[PDB]
Design an enzyme around this catalytic site. Sequence first.
Site, PDB file in Angstrom:
ATOM      1  N   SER D 689      -1.953  -2.632  -5.672  1.00 48.98           N
ATOM      2  CA  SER D 689      -1.844  -2.077  -4.324  1.00 48.98           C
ATOM      3  C   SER D 689      -2.630  -0.807  -4.016  1.00 48.98           C
ATOM      4  O   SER D 689      -3.437  -0.810  -3.077  1.00 48.98           O
ATOM      5  CB  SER D 689      -0.371  -1.805  -4.023  1.00 48.98           C
ATOM      6  OG  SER D 689       0.144  -0.817  -4.895  1.00 48.98           O
ATOM      7  N   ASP D 767       6.244  -9.526  -0.260  1.00 51.11           N
ATOM      8  CA  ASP D 767       6.138  -8.235  -0.927  1.00 51.11           C
ATOM      9  C   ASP D 767       7.054  -7.212  -0.256  1.00 51.11           C
ATOM     10  O   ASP D 767       6.857  -6.851   0.908  1.00 51.11           O
ATOM     11  CB  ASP D 767       4.681  -7.780  -0.929  1.00 51.11           C
ATOM     12  CG  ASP D 767       4.435  -6.566  -1.815  1.00 51.11           C
ATOM     13  OD1 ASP D 767       5.373  -6.011  -2.422  1.00 51.11           O
ATOM     14  OD2 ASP D 767       3.252  -6.248  -2.022  1.00 51.11           O
ATOM     15  N   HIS D 799       5.532  -8.497  -5.573  1.00 47.45           N
ATOM     16  CA  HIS D 799       4.535  -7.441  -5.688  1.00 47.45           C
ATOM     17  C   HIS D 799       3.682  -7.580  -6.935  1.00 47.45           C
ATOM     18  O   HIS D 799       2.450  -7.545  -6.852  1.00 47.45           O
ATOM     19  CB  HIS D 799       5.222  -6.070  -5.677  1.00 47.45           C
ATOM     20  CG  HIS D 799       4.283  -4.927  -5.459  1.00 47.45           C
ATOM     21  ND1 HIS D 799       4.566  -3.640  -5.866  1.00 47.45           N
ATOM     22  CD2 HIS D 799       3.066  -4.874  -4.870  1.00 47.45           C
ATOM     23  CE1 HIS D 799       3.562  -2.847  -5.539  1.00 47.45           C
ATOM     24  NE2 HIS D 799       2.639  -3.570  -4.933  1.00 47.45           N
TER      25      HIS D 799
END
EC number: 3.4.14.5
Lengths: 272, 127, 827, 822
Positions: D689, D767, D799
């Site tokens: 991320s 997510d 995630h």
Amino acid sequence: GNVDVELIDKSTNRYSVWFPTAGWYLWSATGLGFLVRDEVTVTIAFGSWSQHLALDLQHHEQWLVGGPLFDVTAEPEEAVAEIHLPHFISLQAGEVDVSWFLVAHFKNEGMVLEHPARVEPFYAVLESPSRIASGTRLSIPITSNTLIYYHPHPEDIKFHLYLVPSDALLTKAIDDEEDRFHGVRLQTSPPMEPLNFGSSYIVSNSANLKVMPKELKLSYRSPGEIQHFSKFYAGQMKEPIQLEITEKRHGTLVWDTEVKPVDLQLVAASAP
Amino acid sequence: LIYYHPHPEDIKFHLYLVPSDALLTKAIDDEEDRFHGVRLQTSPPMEPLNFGSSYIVSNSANLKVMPKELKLSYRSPGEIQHFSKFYAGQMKEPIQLEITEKRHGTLVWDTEVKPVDLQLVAASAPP
Amino acid sequence: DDPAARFQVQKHSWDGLRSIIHGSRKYSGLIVNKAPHDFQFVQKTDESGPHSHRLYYLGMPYGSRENSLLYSEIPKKVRKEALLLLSWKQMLDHFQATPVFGITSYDFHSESGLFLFQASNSLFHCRDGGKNGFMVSPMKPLEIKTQCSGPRMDPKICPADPAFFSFINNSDLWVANIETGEERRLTFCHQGLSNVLDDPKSAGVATFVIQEEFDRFTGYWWCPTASWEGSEGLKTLRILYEEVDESEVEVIHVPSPALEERKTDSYRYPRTGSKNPKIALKLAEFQTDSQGKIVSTQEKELVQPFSSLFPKVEYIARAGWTRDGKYAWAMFLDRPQQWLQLVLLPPALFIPSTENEEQRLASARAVPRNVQPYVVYEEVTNVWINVHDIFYPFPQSEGEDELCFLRANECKTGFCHLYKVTAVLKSQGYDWSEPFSPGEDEFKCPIKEEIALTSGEWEVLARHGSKIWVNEETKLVYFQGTKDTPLEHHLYVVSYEAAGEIVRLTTPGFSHSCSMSQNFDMFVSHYSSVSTPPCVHVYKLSGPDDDPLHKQPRFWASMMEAASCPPDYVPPEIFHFHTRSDVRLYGMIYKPHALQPGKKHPTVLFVYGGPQVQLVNNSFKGIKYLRLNTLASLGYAVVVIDGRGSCQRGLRFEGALKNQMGQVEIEDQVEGLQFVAEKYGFIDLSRVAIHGWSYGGFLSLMGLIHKPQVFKVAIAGAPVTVWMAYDTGYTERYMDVPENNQHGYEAGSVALHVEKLPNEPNRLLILHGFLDENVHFFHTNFLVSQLIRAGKPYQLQIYPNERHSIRCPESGEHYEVTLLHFLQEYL
Amino acid sequence: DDPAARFQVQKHSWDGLRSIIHGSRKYSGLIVNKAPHDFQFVQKTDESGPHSHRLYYLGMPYGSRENSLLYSEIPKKVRKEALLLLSWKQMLDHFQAITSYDFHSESGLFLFQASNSLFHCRDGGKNGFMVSPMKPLEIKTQCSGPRMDPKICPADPAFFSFINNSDLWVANIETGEERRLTFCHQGLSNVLDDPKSAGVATFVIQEEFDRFTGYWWCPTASWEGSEGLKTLRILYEEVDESEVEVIHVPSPALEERKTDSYRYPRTGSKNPKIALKLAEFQTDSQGKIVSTQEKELVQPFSSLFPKVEYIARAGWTRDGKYAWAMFLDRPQQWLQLVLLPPALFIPSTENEEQRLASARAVPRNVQPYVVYEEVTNVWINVHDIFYPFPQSEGEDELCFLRANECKTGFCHLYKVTAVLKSQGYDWSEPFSPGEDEFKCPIKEEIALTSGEWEVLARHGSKIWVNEETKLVYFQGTKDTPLEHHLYVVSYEAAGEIVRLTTPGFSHSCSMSQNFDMFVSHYSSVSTPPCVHVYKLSGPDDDPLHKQPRFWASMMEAASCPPDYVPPEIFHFHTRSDVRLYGMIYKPHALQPGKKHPTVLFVYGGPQVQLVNNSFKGIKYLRLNTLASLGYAVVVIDGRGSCQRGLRFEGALKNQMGQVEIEDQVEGLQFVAEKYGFIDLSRVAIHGWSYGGFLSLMGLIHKPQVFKVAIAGAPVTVWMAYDTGYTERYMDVPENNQHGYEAGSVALHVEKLPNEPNRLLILHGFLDENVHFFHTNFLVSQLIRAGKPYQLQIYPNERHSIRCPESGEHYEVTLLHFLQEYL
């Protein structure tokens, strides 16, 4: 010969004309031939193609509007038998057909289109009108808009301002009411018009024209274009700067897509 | 998506120290010009006309009026909208702040790769 | 293998491809102008003025972003060797009707001349042509104020009393009055305390599956005449509406347009197997004094519950009233959708509705024994009923029984044809207080006669907002049909007394969308050919009145000339061919621009293939399939085929996909490809792309699964990947019931056959709008899921702000440049 | 330039690439064996058997995939020349499961959660030490729903407590009695209609302040002395989530097409309304709940404690006198330690006269004591290190240890002595506290450690304070920032810092309660992770210098992959002369004079250190697959990374996204000059991320260096990300619009490349951390700006890609994308 006018109001530009007897009666200040057979009290007003056309046919690519727009009112029943009405588009056999020509009438109904009978090399005949807003010009090609091929007439002005001549070159198709409206629109920085015509060859719609001075000054706004519009808008003007009082000016209107040019003049400063 | 004929105009007014221009990018219906002019007749200019927009703009017109150099520029995207005869014009009011001879601007679309009007103005004749 | 005879497409840069798509779409804003529609002829009846009628319609005059109500003036006389083009005059003075945009639809009442319409978050009206004269300059439309909050959906003027109208507000039926400004709720079933997950009772609204698969956008119908109870002076005014309960139907969350908030909207979405919403018909009556003020009101309900009086009736396709007002009709339909039946419900059959079960018994005693519902017509079929909303009943002022109606019937002969049917209303006599179970056909009337007005190997246009126009004084019925050819929609007329010759009124060589005057003297036709773009011409029926059938349609005036094609547009060529089963299929082809003989160009097989859509017809494709021409101008052969399963070829033709959809249409597309390959010579079989949207993408994936050797790539847009998740109305109609047809659900659910997709990469691009309410993003999600689980590559593209059709031009431009890039590199 | 000096990666088919990834992970269970954790030493107390203790830990016994409670037998006598490796003795009777088990040392009680329900057992107490496995008992419940977060009472082993239906419950082993204590949640509808919770940690606290409990038992037993009733307190956090924005996220069951509501606090928007509360009850000797009682502060919490936003941590002192709590402000720069004595909490009722009655009843000397106040200019990291001492002599002058990074810039332990001087408050009459009301003055704040290194406090590390030897064992990076070592120091005097772990490795350690042995889970870049048991041994006259001698080994370092070469650690300096570390995986079968294409893997964000001397093969195996295919792999931790000082981490303050990428490009340019196999024309940036957010910033602001960018799960708009993370670094969105726009990468799509196949966006659909909206808004602005992209969805992944099939697809997609377009 020349017949009088009476301007009732300059804003919507309405003329009243007294027509004595039968006659041909060409009036080339705007380009009307009035085949009449009696006393005619006729009124000619000003129409713009933007407000009366249905807004689809300006941007239509087989509806190239020609001509200026006239609100003519006259006496019916063979009093005004034929209206020879000014178009500008060219009369050649290839890529232009006589049956593509139509004449419109702007009634409260809408737009009435009929085929004319004969096309003259500046005019088209309107046979026995039945009345207002009828001076029109439309065209339906079956081929695209880029090749109707009529050439403008240029008009150029040399003017003395802070001891520097600004020129003024405009290239629009022959509509004398559009010519006088561009003149009065340019009259804020006023014109003086010598008599020159760049009618050498044929140039089509959506043509990009380059302005070339053969002897050079500060060249400005060189990729000009050929468009037509209603009798209000700003034209495709050229305003080069001379900065001196030299006598001769060699100007050239030249294409870009095909190598051949279209126009060349040599103009003097005899009366600046 | 109507393709309407644009109205570009570069009004200038040479004030006592800071000459203020007025860039009009507006649609036209043949009444707003005189009313907006007599609104701005408190600061009475002349009209130095320039290169008219040969190419034609469309609806929801957000354009960039980009000068080639730097000038006094807030509100740098220009917008083309219609309005009645009571509202102020959607137009730029720059001040070029000195006595430089020339200024050059362009009008550029958002998603396109092409410009639409390439304008030039000279300050050699200040009203 | 041999590159001497293979055309290679010139690989453009991405910005080049954008430049090409923009050069395609310079005239796309001009080629579609939202061509005028919803025409309403009104005569002038002046005998001295110049205009015979005024034509009212919707349009954008291209000078504004908004769609608005407009009019034209139809003259009394126009001359030959001329061409009259109408000015589009305004009734609404240059305001904005949006926060397509503008006024989507409007309602009209002829006698008062009342135009009630919906515009920007409020209701509006105006009036023109009653005892008030026909104006010239437009005025402001009067806005109708309300004390109730929320939007006012689907408004209709009462035909019996034009001063009163009605609308839906917060899924309840309301009623108002124009001049006094008073309103009143009629159904109090939807309290609106919370979400639809906790407030599932609705009234007068069309649900999801009814709205989007049975094409009904209203759930209430005014009574056209006003009964008189005669207490002292009270004018009763009835409305039939359908009450619907959505409690036991599955709720799905779909993302809202406002992506920043990250909120969803609940949707009562009935998937197959699950329960459809629980329907009922209901009377909302009220009364009025002579001064025009509402006095009393009354909800009414059937003497039995609806589910018990009409067992196994699942959907109310349509409903309305007979013109005299004596009966409220309704077309019912079964859950397999093979058992349609029309029923008339006389207003005395509906007792009032109260919780007091003794008052209920009281008015159950009060209802007479003779009144009952009469099932006049019962269409039963082995394929599926295509719902045709063509009824029109005739007045029966002599002999108050013996109902005469017109009825479209596709299940009988296989093709949708009109019939005149006369049934007899014989009352059996029922004590409506005692509850009972009806038999299978106990309300079924015996038929006196069933004359067929049309017959042949062609069908009458009935669905999709087409309709019939019945002149009762000349005794003629004007319909649209495909009698000349399946590729064209022509206006025909026939007599319903003497079913003789069927006279076409539209010019051949085009396809026509027509609309008659209410006085049947002139019609409009919005028509087009493959070559000619759409025009809208006004024709005039003219001739001796003694023979009205042969009134010659002579062209009167024109509304729009054909807003023309781009210069980069060549029209496509229509062809036909026969299959190995000897069934004639039609197809189109866009040839590669600047074609040279010898070169085998790569071919994009565009496809929809599913029912209710005819891709190939003699109508202008450039207004909607400009991308196919762009492909052609880059050098792709573009092929378009209507295999078996497409519409406008009859029931037996449509029914080749029955319980096996996905398997036979793609076979027809393959066969059409092979036909175009031998007949022409520019089809490269090694470079074939299959491409389409929702059904087309589902088929594109079936092409790549069951015919991988022919289709090199597959651009699947918004595909239906699991039929178990698609809703009842569509899926059950064609694929019977899931628990019955498990073999065909698994065989035609493409997401369960991912193992058969190619192991090679760059062969499959999945497109999907994230906010899609029809074929949900779950379908693409489950497909990509099973691709992950099977270890197969894919490309994917999302449209986060686009629901079903790519509406906004930047997103459509990206879609097209993605399509051109994908073909350039990987085809 | 030179096409003969540029390595061409071999174009494999997709099935070939799958064959390669499968051949990488055909020994995956041998790599990630889930090496043991949660170690618990228990003494035998017989002095006659062979084993001195029993070590408890988690594992699989290789008979099942499920993690389970196990034990080892640590012998009191060990012989030389013995690599002693011990089997994993299995506790339960093979039933279908247990993680995060709770333990109580005195009775030896093991209470755990296993997949539907709670279980328990007891060993090492007054019963015998088992050898054969026994059945752990099931706790029968009347509650409807899962029973989350269970904890054993320290004072009485018979009682325990758990959360059920977001409400605090309490139970007893022998009688089976369960009883609710909180009544703010009814379960009448969803969380939108029922927004009040009690005793559970909310979203932003759970996932950014790293606390997963919202209730803390009192460790001691109180006696009100009615007749014989033994009171037992619990401190818990009530949370009112009414004013916080709700977001819908898709459920795992995609078929149902349903979402779950989530109370997600965006930045600027309101956090949950917090309060501290005492839930008491009493018991007879028979083990019956005589009565229960909710208890509340004399004031509203928001009024007694202005400008407080987050309860970072909380608990109790060991004697039970005060309940401590770390408070924290919304800018996250104003942490404060607070003591809440139980008499500060009056009873709770709707009756405002009973309320005044016990407001009069509460004494004047009792008050909350703000003992410590950390204030900083950058941000407070929550350090969960707070060891208070018994004040059983001289009943004042609280002595505690506290990690404090804000003072000098590095997290160091301190001994701090505050003095609790009572001001005297009339708690019935309300008042507004000012700025410095309850802050106690400090006697002294000796710093036990100091330097250019940190004491490990976050990520579940902790200190161990031996009270008889007067020593504190902590973890730190004193040798180098790349290696976690166990150190010991005295807290009475700033003595020398003694390292206990072997150099050349990085260690995760855990001490015995009797402080004679520790565990270390350690590794290096080259060696796989091992788990060794060390033994403190020496004379008691100097316990500080007690020598850790290797006693026994639990697991040896596992099988290296046959295609595993260890990566090379390096460091370098910037133009600003800060030392940054980095790793590199060299291409297999390197030929000198050839420039290979380079994948700059990155995270770059705070709280994560990529580059260290620890084993990467467990979950950076994909990086080895790239290297074995021939890609140079470069990894840089630029400024803004963890464990290098607060001033170092604080270079991203209000400009996060801008300085990290500059450090990554400079790291690339260093590796390019130092080595000779970096092809600068073929550079890929890639990460998850934060790494994907940076990958997109790399392709935006330095497009000429990065050829492609594989952005996995990127955060594209900081206005949409949650408070705890974003506000900490990017202070307030109202006050930092320049940096919100500059770092919101989705607002800079115009700067993305117009040419295609340079940007691959990866995203897990479900997510919870960085939602699919971020990718959606990115794709939206790409659509609106007319820029190409590729995209890949993982519909069943939240995630981290946890499913092996989904990870295999992710990697084969990564290899294909690099193969074709780098």
